[PDB]
Amino acid sequence: TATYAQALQSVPETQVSQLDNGLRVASEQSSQPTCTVGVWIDAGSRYESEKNNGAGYFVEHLAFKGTKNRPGNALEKEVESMGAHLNAYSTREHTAYYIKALSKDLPKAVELLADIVQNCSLEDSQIEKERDVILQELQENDTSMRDVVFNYLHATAFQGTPLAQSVEGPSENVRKLSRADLTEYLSRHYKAPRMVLAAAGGLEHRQLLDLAQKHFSGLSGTYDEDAVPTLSPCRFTGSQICHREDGLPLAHVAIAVEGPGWAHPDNVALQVANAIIGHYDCTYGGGAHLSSPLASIAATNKLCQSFQTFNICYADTGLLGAHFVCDHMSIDDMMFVLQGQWMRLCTSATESEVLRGKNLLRNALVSHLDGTTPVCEDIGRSLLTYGRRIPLAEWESRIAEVDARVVREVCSKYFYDQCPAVAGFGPIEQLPDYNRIRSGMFWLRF
Amino acid sequence: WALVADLLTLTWIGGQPVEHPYITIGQLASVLYFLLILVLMPTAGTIENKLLKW
Amino acid sequence: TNIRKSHPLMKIVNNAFIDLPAPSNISSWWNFGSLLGICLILQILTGLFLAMHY
Amino acid sequence: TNIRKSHPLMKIVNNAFIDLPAPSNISSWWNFGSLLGICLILQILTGLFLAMHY
Amino acid sequence: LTRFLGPRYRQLARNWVPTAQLWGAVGAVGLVWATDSRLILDWVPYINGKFK
Amino acid sequence: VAPTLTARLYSLLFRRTSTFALTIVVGALFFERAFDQGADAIYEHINEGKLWKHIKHKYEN
Amino acid sequence: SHTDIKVPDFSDYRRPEVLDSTKSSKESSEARKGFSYLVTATTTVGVAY
Amino acid sequence: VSASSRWLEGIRKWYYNAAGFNKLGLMRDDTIHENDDVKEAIRRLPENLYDDRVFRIKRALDLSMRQQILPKEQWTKYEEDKSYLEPYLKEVIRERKEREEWAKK
Amino acid sequence: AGVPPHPQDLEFTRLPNGLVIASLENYAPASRIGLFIKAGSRYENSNNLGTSHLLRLASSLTTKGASSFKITRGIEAVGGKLSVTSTRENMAYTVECLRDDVDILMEFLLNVTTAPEFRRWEVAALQPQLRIDKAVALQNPQAHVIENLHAAAYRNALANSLYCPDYRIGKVTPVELHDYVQNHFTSARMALIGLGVSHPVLKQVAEQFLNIRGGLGLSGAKAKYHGGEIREQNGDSLVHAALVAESAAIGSAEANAFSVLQHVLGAGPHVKRGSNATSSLYQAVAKGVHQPFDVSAFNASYSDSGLFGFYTISQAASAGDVIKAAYNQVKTIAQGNLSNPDVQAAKNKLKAGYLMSVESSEGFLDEVGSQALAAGSYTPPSTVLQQIDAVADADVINAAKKFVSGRKSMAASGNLGHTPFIDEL
């Protein structure tokens, strides 16, 4: 018959092995003809000072434009010709480079990744070409109201801390960053005990460890000692940023309290409550019959174009709340209906709705880990944030634990009577005054 | 109309002394007022529904 | 929905005392409008208790 | 424009006594609502002229 | 009437029971203090000072 | 004193609006006794001997 | 380019427990809400009298 | 089918005639009190039934006002009182009851 | 050892009534079931345009076995999804949940597809969603172009519009949906695909609930290629343009040759922020064009026709130069200027790309379903890679030859002052 609990046991164990220099090498072997290999670096914008805030993003732009062993076109041509896809990203805490390739092409994929990671030929003519490209991207990102509001939310919540900074950096830093600025960041940050070589697909683990000694060895000899860089905690501030712009058709609001951070066991319970509230979009079929009270009232009364809950995680901190996009006249109702939902759950959560939230999460977790790219991403990220790969059976075990009593206790710990960080953009005349938002963070009835 | 007539009965009894016939029919009208509002009229409405197959 | 907005009575209270858009910069000289209302109420409540004996 | 609609005071009078949509078929039994208002006013006007001498 | 009878509502009652208990305490002590209700106030140590 | 007096007062009594109201009500009772009598005691000192409560023992039976 | 928008320094107006960038604000959230609400409780207690 | 079940039917025809909405040309379902289930059932009616309903209500309010009644032949006959709202109203209550069963667990 | 369980094989069954059943026990924590129907936009006619769009939006409406409210609440209770994904040929109703909950979602699935009620008031309430749904899709300039491309190419079925025509919004009737389901949602036009389900169970439900006759027969009226051009003055900063000719029907050997030619010229990017060094069209344009541009080989295959050519995004003034550079690049392949390693690279791109496309259960299920409907069989990846390999360099040149010399179809939007007509290419 094969039950769901039984099926969680069936997924193979992530094999973790450490190299002599500090490079963690981890694999999840499956049956697939393809794979995803990558390097996950514990480096972002939180690691950057005010004077070098665009650095990680600048290196990301240069990482595929030529190495000492493969100049200019060479990397592109090699990856393209074997049918492989080469990708990268940088978040406030993590930088990643990964190849989607055939499993038989795993030797070459690992080799090419090593070249990008260690031997990036940061060519003077190229860093000058890249500055015009990043500047254009900044003008591009301005038009995305969503990207702006979340950047504002980090800026106001994490006021005067490394976390207030965006991944991209400011315009001043993009046009001023030197060749020496980027090599200094690279030497300080791209060090083996802060790197995970992750892989998922039709590969044996022994194959991967061989390749890591074959291509990543040569980051030892002597390392660290003089400059040990550990992250200092980031103070969250209850605050508001309001960018009034009546020329934009719809308002964007992101509201969040301080979350606990990656490691904390009660991230599971917060996520269940975030599932109960869920997310909405004007293209959803459900309408008035949707389970979630906020979603159902929002559809019925045409209260927005969309909303989404989030639990953004950082080391020892994070942002927990909702973002929505709505008409100028609908901001007040939307705040009220959302805040009332946080409070309902904080004081009076019920057994049934909590099981639904548990079920959405089980489904979210399993649907997410589908194919080599999501699993390889989960291997790299988890090794940086948890130290191990948390098996699906354990996630289920930690999900199954969460009753209504858990939800309202954990919700209260973070949501009840707390100062939110509020980010507003667009036609925001009807956006509530901070005091009133603060007032919606408690119930006089309770 | 029983309620209106019953209230007119209570009106009549109010302006009369507390002797023999008036004590009994007075409290008779009194119990009727409350029975007519609380029990009798809510029953008639239910029966009237049944008669219309409603 | 917020009952402060929908309910016919509370609608007035909301539009008059709660959600009314007011200037950010109004002086202590704007306080006397409310103080006159306090004074009119104070005069009604003291005046009545005097009228019970006057 | 019709000032019965625009003017803040006359707006109420128009919505209450003039342009209010009323049922075509209301009995003489609907008259007592206005008659109670007449009676409350009548009582205030006679009551005051009594209070000038009482 | 019959619509409010179910597992969720029993949970919802259990959730608001400590709150509805504490509002009763607010109401009682509130009434006791406002009337100077001697019957109850004869029991409390510092408030006791009203020697006939 | 390890977490602040205010911190332990919020945790125990100011979180819930129920216990916040209860602390105000219980605090109103105890304040009235300490104040009424305390202010009366201050009124005794500025009017020492002048009041009937001081004279009382002069005219007994 | 919207990434130039930094939030102005509020250290001038900040409560002493909210001065440190290194220090989590959670460790003083109870004490700060506590102080401001004690003012409210005492206000009500005085008005109730 | 039965002699006494023909008598319940004749007592029902008696009440129907005593109620006297048929004297104002109304059908039984015209006379229903408008609650939330009812409002929805009216809303769910097809064009032809809604339009007829509107006219019958219009006609009866006009008669009510002028304190008249229809000629005897034009009264709604008990036998042909079409219960047009029945299946609509039954479906709305069916849907409500489900929502309420769901809101219980 | 950290090894997985030995992988099970796909189980395929053609029922005597025409219906296909396919399943794979992958032992996944979640399950996926798709009912794929030969009911795409091409089966609409001029009297009922947009009926399959409203139907796509109607998956949550009252059925005989489950009310609108029940479908929504019951699926969400278990954290499930119900999605309907239309193409020009197909309609796919895909259901998704954890494996303990299949039975509930199957029942919902069967109700939505085999016992919908299309209630008068429910359907009237949903009409405004066609406007919302279209507006959201049509905010990609590509959508309207590829819509105009198909309307220009065909006179017939594939010319149909995928999103409901504006004049039909609020006009598609309950009866039209009833008629669309009765004559397209039949056994011989259907395939039931299961993932994380056992074959006896899927075969059981198909034999119990999916035995439906009395519809239409073949793959509709044979899609008649015509050619022509649709032009949309836009004021949209950049000009989007698609050049296309008739290619090959899906499954044929020639179709595979067109897919290799698509990868020779260049499909999507491979490197995040890359010059696309192996992209034949991109390099050909970039030689002559220095502003922001994009160019890609467009490849569309259907049951009885195909459209191959290219798609361009360029500055309004640069439009003619980009299209002419792109077209001439194809012309050189047609003339015979194509090397063996060139084709090899394209082959690896197509092979690996296909393999990557079926990596997830979302992509695997969609492929098996489309195969079941188009071919009546399942073709394993190893043999698809065999068919890709079978393509000779001459076959690729001939596919280019066929495009260069065939009656063209064009669709363009933006400031078209410098965008060429077919006439001028």
Ligand code: HEM
């Ligand atoms: C029966 C005593 C009165 C009461 C209860 C009263 C009530 C108030 C209130 C509540 C306000 C709004 C708050 C404020 O701006 O002060 C106000 C404003 C105003 N009142 Fe009065 N008022 C009275 C006497 C007067 C008199 C005697 C005048 C003129 C001879 C006056 C003319 C105004 C004006 C012009 C304003 C607008 C002020 C502004 O907002 O700029 N009122 N009144």
Ligand code: HEM
């Ligand atoms: C517009 C608000 C009012 C004003 C400005 C007002 C003003 C005054 C003034 C100036 C006096 C004489 C003061 C004195 O010699 O003690 C007075 C006394 C009096 N008022 Fe009013 N009053 C007002 C409201 C009322 C109302 C509402 C009542 C009736 C409920 C009332 C009943 C009395 C009575 C009985 C006295 C005589 C007793 C006395 O002199 O203390 N007053 N008022």
Ligand code: HEM
């Ligand atoms: C202070 C004496 C009262 C006044 C001045 C008053 C005023 C009125 C007025 C003007 C109307 C509208 C006209 C009409 O339908 O009669 C009305 C209707 C109404 N009143 Fe009163 N009324 C009073 C007493 C009452 C009482 C004692 C009750 C119930 C115990 C009542 C309940 C109603 C209701 C239910 C209506 C709606 C009638 C309808 O339109 O169908 N009122 N009232």
Ligand code: HEM
């Ligand atoms: C709610 C409307 C009112 C009602 C139902 C009402 C009722 C009554 C009744 C039943 C009497 C005794 C009748 C008698 O023996 O002559 C009375 C007398 C009196 N009323 Fe009113 N009244 C009302 C309004 C008022 C008002 C507004 C005033 C003050 C301006 C007032 C002042 C008086 C006075 C001074 C008397 C005594 C003189 C007398 O008995 O004729 N009344 N009222």
